[PDB]
Amino acid sequence: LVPRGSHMRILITGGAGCLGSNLIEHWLPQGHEILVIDNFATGKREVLPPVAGLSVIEGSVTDAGLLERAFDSFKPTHVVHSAAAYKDPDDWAEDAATNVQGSINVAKAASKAGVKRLLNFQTALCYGRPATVPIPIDSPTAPFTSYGISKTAGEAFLMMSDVPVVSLRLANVTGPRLAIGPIPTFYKRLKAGQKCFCSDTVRDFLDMSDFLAIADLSLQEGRPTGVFNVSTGEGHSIKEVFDVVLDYVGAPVPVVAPGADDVPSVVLDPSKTETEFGWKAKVDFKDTITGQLAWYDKYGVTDIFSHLS
Amino acid sequence: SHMRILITGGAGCLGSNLIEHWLPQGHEILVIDNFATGKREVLPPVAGLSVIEGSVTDAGLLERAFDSFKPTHVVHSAAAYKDPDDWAEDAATNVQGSINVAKAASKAGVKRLLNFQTALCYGRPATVPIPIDSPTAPFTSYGISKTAGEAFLMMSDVPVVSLRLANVTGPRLAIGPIPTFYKRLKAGQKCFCSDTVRDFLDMSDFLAIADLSLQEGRPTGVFNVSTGEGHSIKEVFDVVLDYVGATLAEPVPVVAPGADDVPSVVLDPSKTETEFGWKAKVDFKDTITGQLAWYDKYGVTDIFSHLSAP
Ligand SMILES: NC(=O)c1ccc[n+]([C@@H]2O[C@H](COP(=O)([O-])OP(=O)(O)OC[C@H]3O[C@@H](n4cnc5c(N)ncnc54)[C@H](O)[C@@H]3O)[C@@H](O)[C@H]2O)c1
Ligand SMILES: NC(=O)c1ccc[n+]([C@@H]2O[C@H](COP(=O)([O-])OP(=O)(O)OC[C@H]3O[C@@H](n4cnc5c(N)ncnc54)[C@H](O)[C@@H]3O)[C@@H](O)[C@H]2O)c1
């Protein structure tokens, strides 16, 4: 039915997560039909209200039968693979099961169901310790943590599908219900008058609105396929992040090593994504950090505030 | 120097040749295998040799095996590959199986774990011979699952040696171009050579580095095992042709490789020579001739055992 001529029946694995839920808040108001499959390892049941257009199956991407049944009942036109395990770095079996096996299961099921487009999200940890920053899209994958290793094989399997597949390697996405990392940590701790530390690292940050726009483009029939970096292409230090928070909150911070497994600089080159999609990120660094903080002022550092009615 | 060796995949080509090398030495060996590709005939009921039929994907069975047998040493030689569209099995055996073996070895505090790795981990290399510090870049089910598996093994607290291998020839090799040219030439069938370059390694050179890899205080990490020299399939064909004595009715066509047939896969073994002091002794001609001599005695078979059964 609606949007007229481009209604999506969208199967989102990992839909109770940060990215999934934001995507849902973006697409459900437009009239798309969404089915979520989540096991609530990190995702919250509170971000999926019983609203029209939205169905939820509590389940794993590792469960191939649950997937065949969901894909058969629902008949998606489009798939967003957003399920990832990561929370216990020593539980390699879970990471392999979710991130590799779950990806293979989503890919085989998608293929059989004849989906039009599949959208995967990749971690920049796939790049390990890069030789060239900003990291070019044709850089080698070189992970050295469980999450990086399993995610890297997951993506590589997806890229063997006959289903058209877009895999976006992402900058740290800021937006509603981000409750981990330096931004909420400095906000909370500065407001509490606690000592903060800045790792001497460079990272890149992406506003939710820019993530939403490349996600939209990625699911359009006929658009490019393959692996793509999603970023402004600009890097900012953790100290720089801390500086925006301090100023915003209204309150001499030490700058320290690079811990062992803490990659000194991670910034992605988006140029090929700009070329093939006509996409460019609009919101700059200060507006990106400030908008996350503004959200914390309204709802607090929480992952359970729903913008759905 | 007595080893209690747990060898996953011991019924296959590498596993069984290793067992025939080590069992006469008084070593104690437990084989875990599911017989997907490897054969039951290569594992006679002999003193020193135990066989558990099972999967490396079975975490229960591995835990029970490492507990009862208490290995000092692990050789992870189990791999799935036969159906390139069966990604689930490849991921199950090669990634989950490797994690299971790694965790179990770590828990049992084994001294040394030895892994074998396919040169498909390198995908399409930028430089040939392939340097050890080259990126992994697999694009097939086998290569991607194996790449992830090796990477997990590398995160173990056990000392790990992962050997990236040239094509190993020896007892019971019954796949690839060598047995295919041998069989077809003797039967008067037309052969095709793709226009590819590969490396080949005699069993005796493989046995020598495997030995070194399981010695305490030896180097750890990833290593290329090879002579470092590359030979086309056409060169392989010529050795077989000459050896077999056949007369050709037509000159063999050399055809361009498929899209997924990597044109040149030769490994640079130089860090291995530096750190182990190992060097392959058997040249190309002798490597190929040695395989064909073995075929002449036993035929192209993967069920002939060199172990004396009671
Ligand atoms: N948010 C980012 O800045 C960022 C950066 C790089 C990559 N990514 C990728 O984007 C995706 C979403 O990330 P996020 O930030 O929303 O993380 P998240 O933890 O908020 O969401 C992942 C969701 O997957 C679910 N999940 C875990 N295992 C599952 C399984 N077996 N079956 C079904 N669901 C399962 C969790 O319950 C969770 O809701 C992940 O794949 C992640 O690797 C995100
Ligand atoms: N032969 C070579 O030149 C070569 C080259 C590169 C890499 N390797 C690697 O060396 C190892 C041995 O190779 P091979 O040449 O002996 O192949 P092979 O097929 O003869 O043996 C693999 C063995 O593993 C067994 N197996 C498969 N799945 C299993 C599982 N779930 N649990 C337990 N056993 C399982 C098979 O039955 C088989 O006996 C593999 O890891 C392979 O990737 C070999």
Author numbering:
A (entry chain B): -6 to 244, 249 to 306
B (entry chain A): -1 to 308
What do the authors say?
The wbm locus contains three neighbouring SDR genes (wbmF, wbmG and wbmH), all of which have been annotated as nucleotide-sugar epimerases/dehydratases. The abrogation or reduction of O-antigen expression as a result of wbmF, wbmG or wbmH mutations implicates all three genes in the biosynthesis of this molecule, and is consistent with the hypothesis that these three adjacent SDR genes catalyse the UDP-d-ManNAc3NAcA to UDP-l-GalNAc3NAcA conversion, which is probably required for O-antigen synthesis.
Soaking and co-crystallisation experiments with His6-WbmF and His6-WbmG revealed the binding mode for the nucleotide portion of the sugar nucleotide substrates of these enzymes. The X-ray data from a His6-WbmG crystal soaked with UDP-glucose revealed extra density that could be modelled as far as the α-phosphate. The location of this molecule is consistent with the nucleotide-binding site for SDR homologue structures and with the hydrogen-bonding chemistry expected to bind uridine. No density was visible corresponding to the hexose portion of the soaked compound nor the second phosphate, suggesting that either this portion of the molecule is disordered within the crystal, or the compound was partially hydrolysed and the smaller uridine monophosphate (UMP) preferentially soaked into the substrate-binding pocket. In either case, the data indicate that the glucose-1-phosphate moiety of UDP-glucose is not strongly bound in a single conformation by WbmG. In both structures the β-phosphate is coordinated by a conserved arginine, although the precise location of this phosphate is different in the two structures and both are inconsistent with the β-phosphate positions of bound substrate in the structure of a D128N, E129Q mutant of dTDP-glucose 4,6-dehydratase, DesIV, from S. venezuelae. Unusually, in WbmG the pi-stacking residue (Phe190) is the one that hydrogen bonds with the uracil N-3. S. venezuelae DesIV,23 and Pseudomonas aeruginosa WbpP,25 the hydrophobic contact is provided by the residue in the n + 2 position, whose backbone amide hydrogen bonds with the base's O2 group. This unusual feature of the substrate binding in WbmG could not have been predicted from sequence alignments alone.
